[PDB]
Design a protein around this ligand. Structure first.
Ligand SMILES: [K+]
Ligand SMILES: [Mg+2]
Ligand SMILES: [Mg+2]
Ligand SMILES: [Mg+2]
Ligand SMILES: [Mg+2]
Ligand SMILES: [Mg+2]
Ligand SMILES: [Mg+2]
Ligand SMILES: [Mg+2]
Ligand SMILES: [Mg+2]
Ligand SMILES: [Mg+2]
Ligand SMILES: [Mg+2]
Ligand SMILES: [Mg+2]
Ligand SMILES: [Mg+2]
Lengths: 172, 197, 191, 136
RNA sequence: UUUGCUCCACACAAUAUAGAUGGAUACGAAUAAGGCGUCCUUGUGGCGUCGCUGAACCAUAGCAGGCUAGCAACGGUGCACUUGGCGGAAAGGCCUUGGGUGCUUGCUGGCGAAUUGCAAUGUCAUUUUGCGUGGGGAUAAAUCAUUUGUAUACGACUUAGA
RNA sequence: GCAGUCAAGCGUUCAUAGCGACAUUGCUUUUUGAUUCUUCGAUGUCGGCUCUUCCUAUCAUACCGAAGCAGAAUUCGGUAA
RNA sequence: AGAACUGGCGAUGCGGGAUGAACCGAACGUAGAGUUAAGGUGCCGGAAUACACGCUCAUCAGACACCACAAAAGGUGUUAGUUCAUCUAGACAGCCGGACGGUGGCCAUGGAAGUCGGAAUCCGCUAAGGAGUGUGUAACAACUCACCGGCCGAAUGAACUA
RNA sequence: GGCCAGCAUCAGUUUUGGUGGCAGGAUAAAUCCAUAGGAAUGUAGCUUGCCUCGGUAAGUAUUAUAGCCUGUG
């Protein structure tokens, strides 16, 4: 729904006299802020366990920063989404420097290719593929060849002015 | 910035060019468009010919001389786009349209004047490579414009004359750049360079 | 997917020189010179070792990389046409009426004249494209041979000759008369 | 009798390609491609200029003709070491591109008195140059 | 034609302004390519260089730009003349020759400015028209009425008439 | 009223040359209904005659593809008003 | 056409939905300034030819709710996925070689030999071959394919989803 | 006195900049430094085969005549 941050959200299923110290369930939620993070936490906990916001509590919320924000990684992403006619599971691969950037790319890509809005997508799993040759999508694999170089043909520079006096060039 | 801005319409994406020119006209700038026959429309030639035929079938049923006139010349097709994007039924829009001239080719007054382009309307900068596009001269010939050959002949003549002019100008520019090459290590030139010139 | 890079190879034999400006290809060989304008494809040629040209598409889609191989094939056909040449052999097929195929001149234009096709009184004239040489092959019955450097012109002249002899208002499964391409090969043998 | 094919020498997105940031926090500094993320995205590092190690869209940057040897994925210290060893900053400051940038900054930094001096010196040089052009 | 018409110059009057306030500053083509310079074996050639916008280039100092004295150099520039050429797409412009004349800020001096009072567009442009003063130039038609019938409701059309 | 999709069957064999059951999806507003929104200080209420134009779901004519198209004739279909 | 709850219109202008009683936003004394709503920011037209990732090329493209329509069924168009398979012990496609014997397998049929039908889906040689995938004959024959080989050498096929 | 203005210092409302000090989080994550362990889109070295300069291709070899990843501090 915006530029994403990843939050660990831990909730409780609030204690009673019968059950003190309940079982402290945790989730990694990609959300643009903490209100949405906690909302998504309760949404998925209600999908998983007999609990709701009114019968539980948020024990903790903590943003998780990328441990290595400046190393390029290949992420495998497993999602579950609703199409116009059904629900489907999908696996994709995204090359980027952080989980939040990978997830933002994934949401953009789901919207672009499957018209799957945010509300229709569940992030099942995001995991860095530590070993290349376990990358199984060609659109990522092509970026892992040795000494990868490519030109950027047909450069289009934007003019600051309405009129130009030169009949410009697209060389690069 | 100039009193008259002369746009070389060659390869200029008629709709985007018309947007630029309409805004300039309404802002108060005099615009002269040349080489309207070399303008481009995105989409296949057959697409644009079918579009113009759909335009051509529209006419006042009880008197065709009252209905929308279908001007075949490339300059008048560009003018149709531009008029549709100017509020042409008001006095302000009439003044704006009076600030405009469109031509096929480059007629004598403007053949010796500077021509500019509009990068935000240029086909090579705007269209994705591989996309098909139409040339207004070909579209106009196909829909009844009678003067593509005459315009091409006059343009070949003008280009011969202009290439001769440019050979002379390039020779003189080489002379000037050589005389500026010397006196580049002079004290005045070094002070100019210190000041950025 | 937009493949990062796709490329094809163009082997250049010894007696062939390939001059490629922006996308205007000029192939020169023993038999003559062919030229092609490929400004419609947006590929990139590069000379590797004077016997190999690489043609590449960068960040190209499916259609773009398909047309890359099409460009490779077209340049290969130019080189083959200036080294070995192209010859299309056509056979006249007729059940009753003998098709009379000849070479005639009209204002000096070298038409192929077809008379008596299916008994018709009309005379079918097919112009000969420049570079295409028309020879009637003795020792084979009812065989016309079209030869030239450019496969485009030889094959299109053969197809024009074939289409001028299409049967109208009849069951063409029965009325099989026509002039049909029977062989498509090269001029130089076993090359 | 040799085959002639025009080279069309592009600047290549590659590890070690030197780029000039045109917009953003840096906006005019030099960085080096550390590696390629996507067709439109690279990881760069500008340690000498002060550009942080960052993933950047290629549209936010312009490729320069300058390339140096850099292993793919090199960290900031390694990029700075190879940058200093290859002397990228001086190789760029000697380019006409950098000199034109510097000239436009100097012209923007001229004062009114300095513009008056510029006109006076331009008139002196013009006198000498016109005299030479008439003699020639 | 109760001294008409037109063209040039000048003065005086009106008349407005779709909107000047240093300069519209000219190759063509391509853009998965080009420009320029140079070289040769003149090409779809070799080499070098540039772009990454005109943020340029040119111009630009002087009572809105006065009056003077020099130095240097035979340059720049305005002007009226003048030589030849080219330009018909709407040419109405582009180039060029020679002499004259003014200015020159390329450099160095002398004098002036004030009080528009602390700003007030603080009037500098071009569009038509009229009148007057000189000078050059030209010396008809159309319509009505009559007439024709190739025309025609009337107009209109087509004809004729010193 | 017109048109699709599926394909059990017809078509001597053979689902789809041409058809096509059991089903099912539509389109049209040249049928007739349904409604009562406009008009009851009044839109002249059948048909024909006359005349113009428009649509295409094409009967003919043009050029074609298919056939259970040998020819001839015909049938199905395409661009087509 | 008729009921329920609420909110509206009627009785209501204003900004937006081009246009419109009811929709969106917001309800209204006369003004100034600022900020916004809904809606917009190529030009008409005030406002980014903004930035970013993709998708789409339509010889009827598409383009903002109410709302001014389109469905079933389809498409090696293109994109992204799911699952199952083949593959250097050599895959797919392509070209070429083999494609047998018991055996005219059983039944019928006027005739039926793999191929008008019902039923049985065997065995040997086997690298491999169905009691037969099609063309063909009246039945034959004769071609052809499943199946296995020769060549090539790294990926490939199928069914689905949207 | 009236009409139209300019500037300064204020007041009320507001719009748009420059700059300073703090707080929190994994007392940011990173970078950086130290250390240990690894493999590859395998650096140096070595071997094998090529040949047009002199490089190449295949192995091996985990930092060397490039570097990188991970954990810890
Ligand atoms: K009534
Ligand atoms: Mg006409
Ligand atoms: Mg009445
Ligand atoms: Mg009436
Ligand atoms: Mg039809
Ligand atoms: Mg017939
Ligand atoms: Mg009432
Ligand atoms: Mg209301
Ligand atoms: Mg609407
Ligand atoms: Mg606007
Ligand atoms: Mg569908
Ligand atoms: Mg049989
Ligand atoms: Mg204040």
């Amino acid at each position: 729904m915006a530029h994403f941050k990843e939050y660990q959200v831990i909730g409780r299923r609030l204690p009673t006299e019968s059950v003190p110290e309940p079982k402290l369930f945790r989730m990694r939620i990609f959300a643009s802020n903490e209100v949405i993070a906690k909302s998504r936490y309760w949404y998925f906990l209600q999908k998983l366990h007999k609990v709701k916001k009114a019968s539980g509590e948020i024990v903790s919320i903590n943003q998780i920063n990328e441990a290595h924000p400046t190393k390029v990684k290949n992420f495998g992403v497993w999602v579950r989404y609703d199409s116009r006619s059904g629900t489907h599971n999908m696996y994709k691969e995204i090359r980027d420097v952080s989980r939040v950037a990978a997830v933002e790319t994934l949401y953009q890509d789901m919207a672009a290719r499957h018209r799957a809005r945010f509300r229709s997508i569940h992030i099942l799993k995001v995991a860095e593929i530590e070993k290349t040759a376990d990358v199984k999508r060609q659109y990522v694999k092509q970026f892992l060849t040795k000494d990868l170089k490519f030109p950027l043909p047909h450069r289009v520079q934007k003019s600051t002015k309405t009129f130009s006096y030169k009949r410009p060039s697209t060389f690069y | 910035v100039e009193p008259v801005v002369v746009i070389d319409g060659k390869g200029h994406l008629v709709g985007r060019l018309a947007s630029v020119v309409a805004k300039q006209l309404l802002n108060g700038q005099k615009i002269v468009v040349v080489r309207a026959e070399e303008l481009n429309i995105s989409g296949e030639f057959f697409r644009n010919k079918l579009k113009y035929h759909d335009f051509l079938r529209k006419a006042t049923a009880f008197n065709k001389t009252r209905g929308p006139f279908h001007f075949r010349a490339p300059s008048r097709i560009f003018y149709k786009a531009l008029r549709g994007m100017v509020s042409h039924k008001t006095a302000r829009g009439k003044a704006a349209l009076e600030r405009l001239k469109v031509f096929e080719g480059i007629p004598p007054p403007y053949d010796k004047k500077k021509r500019v382009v509009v990068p935000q309307a240029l086909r090579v900068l705007r269209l994705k490579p591989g996309r098909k596009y139409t040339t207004l001269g070909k579209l106009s010939t196909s829909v009844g414009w009678k003067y593509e050959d005459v315009v091409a002949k006059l343009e070949a003549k003008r280009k011969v004359s202009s290439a001769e002019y440019y050979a002379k100008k390039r020779a003189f520019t080489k002379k000037v750049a050589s005389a500026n090459a010397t006196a580049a290590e002079s004290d005045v030139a070094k002070q100019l360079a210190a000041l950025g010139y | 997917m937009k493949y990062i890079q796709t490329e094809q190879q163009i082997e250049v034999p010894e007696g062939v020189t390939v001059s490629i400006k922006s996308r205007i290809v000029k192939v020169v060989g023993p038999r003559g010179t062919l030229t092609k304008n490929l400004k419609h494809i947006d590929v990139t040629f590069t000379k590797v070792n004077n016997q190999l040209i690489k043609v590449a598409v960068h960040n190209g889609g499916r259609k773009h990389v398909a047309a890359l191989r099409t460009v490779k094939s077209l340049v290969d056909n130019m080189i083959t046409g200036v080294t070995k040449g192209y010859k299309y052999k056509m056979r006249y097929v007729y059940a009753h009426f003998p098709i009379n195929v000849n070479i005639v001149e009209k204002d000096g234009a070298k038409f192929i004249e077809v008379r008596n096709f299916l008994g018709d009184k009309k005379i079918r004239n097919v112009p000969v494209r420049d570079g295409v040489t028309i020879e009637f092959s003795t020792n084979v019955k009812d065989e016309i041979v079209l030869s030239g450097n450019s496969v485009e012109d030889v094959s299109q002249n053969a197809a024009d000759l074939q289409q001028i002899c299409r049967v109208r208002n009849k069951d063409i499964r029965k009325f099989l008369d026509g002039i049909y391409v029977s062989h498509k090969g090269f001029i130089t043998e076993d090359l | 009798t040799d085959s002639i094919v025009k080279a069309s020498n592009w600047r290549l997105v590659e590890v070690g390609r030197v780029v000039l940031i045109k917009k953003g926090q840096s906006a005019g500094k030099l960085a080096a491609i550390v590696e390629i993320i996507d067709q439109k995205k690279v990881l760069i590092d500008g340690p000498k200029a002060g550009v942080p190690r960052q993933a950047i869209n290629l549209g936010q940057v312009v490729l320069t003709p300058l390339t140096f040897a850099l292993p793919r994925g090199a960290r900031t210290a390694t990029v700075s070491k190879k940058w200093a060893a290859a002397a990228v900053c001086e190789k760029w400051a000697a380019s006409s591109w950098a000199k034109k940038i510097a000239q436009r900054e100097r012209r923007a930094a001229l004062t009114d008195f300095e513009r008056f001096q510029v006109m006076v010196l331009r008139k002196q040089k013009r006198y000498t140059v016109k005299k030479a052009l008439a003699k020639a």
